Design a protein around this ligand. Structure first.
Ligand code: MG
Ligand code: ZN
Ligand code: ZN
Ligand code: ZN
Lengths: 158, 145, 146
């Protein structure tokens, strides 16, 4: 009954000449997310929520933007290592919920695929993983398609 | 078997619309474009998220939809334990309308006032929210199977 | 048991001429927040939220005193705090060096074991007012039980 909650936030710039990879899904698009790793904004947000619930710090502490080993890193592999460290700390994951905010492209056709990727990576059934997709209703840099934002929440139990 | 969900919503403030937040009509020169009840939408998504049922976009006034959301959450074998939320609006003042929002939500979710919370914030005049171009709502929901 | 969750948000403008205090920690920087401790307000708000006692505006000295009073009110409402998690979004300066001090400040104020308090740091990847260093945001989540 020793439950804990975590929350996560991530954002990356949307630039030409990068792969667009969200929830481990490679999505056809003229632009992609800029970062040190594969820049998977959704997976990073979830990774942060998990480290946070376990009180193990954050993704920057565990997988630094200034370490060559993670240059172009597969964020699913990073998520699986996160889950491993959370389990090592003594916690089991109960559920994950998340939101993705993007003006474009359409993400609804890819949501189930993202959900399946996360569930596999966390060794969870599909019914304990949720991914929600939204636009920013034309507001701000997100409305101008300058970047894509992700949010996450995770429940664990020690 | 507890589960948590998180919700986010934002809508533009436009002329010629009534301002309805948490089912409360608030006297204001502009309203949300979408009834575009940003708060109820954020709570709805948090509940769908906790029950792992997807989102509003996949599922669908906003009170009728929240009542339906709560129905589908119950359908999946989940009971709602609590809701917490935040409204971010630079204008107008939300303080006098909070208690009514809470009452509306508690009624729609078949919950005691005890387990529903609504919080109000400005955006310190920063960004589009600060300039009164939109209103953002955030929500968190705990459920049990 | 009777678990409840809360969430919190806070932002403050970042301008030269004021000190920078995040999580009860003064941080050397050319700008500060117009004590305006974004981290502690968000956590305070999350706690009132979980307890269903309203918000910081309804209830309320620097931000640590307010956090301390918040926790006393949560306790008397019949609730015990299980854990807190949070994120600070700030383009500059580097916050990672100061996380353990913040965690110590928050855990002391809430009378929690250190391993039940977490603080994360992000930049906004140069996007929006946050990414231009015009403001700093904090987010919080708190789990409580009655
Ligand atoms: Mg935001
Ligand atoms: Zn990232
Ligand atoms: Zn909406
Ligand atoms: Zn504040």
């Amino acid at each position: 009954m020793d439950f804990r909650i975590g929350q996560g936030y991530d954002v990356h710039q949307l630039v030409p000449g990068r792969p667009l990879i969200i929830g481990g899904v490679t999505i056809p698009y003229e632009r992609g997310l800029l970062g040190h790793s594969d820049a998977d904004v959704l997976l990073h947000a979830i990774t942060d929520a998990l480290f946070g619930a376990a009180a193990l710090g954050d993704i920057g502490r565990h997988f630094s933007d200034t370490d060559p080993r993670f240059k172009g890193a597969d964020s699913r592999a990073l998520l699986r290592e996160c889950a491993s460290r959370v389990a090592q700390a003594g916690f089991a994951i109960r559920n994950v919920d998340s939101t993705i905010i993007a003006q474009a492209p359409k993400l609804a056709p890819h949501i189930d695929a993202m959900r399946a990727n996360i569930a596999a990576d966390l060794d969870l059934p599909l019914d304990r993983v949720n991914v929600k997709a939204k636009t920013n209703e034309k507001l701000g840099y997100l409305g101008r398609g300058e970047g894509i934002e992700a949010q996450a929440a995770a429940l664990v139990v020690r």
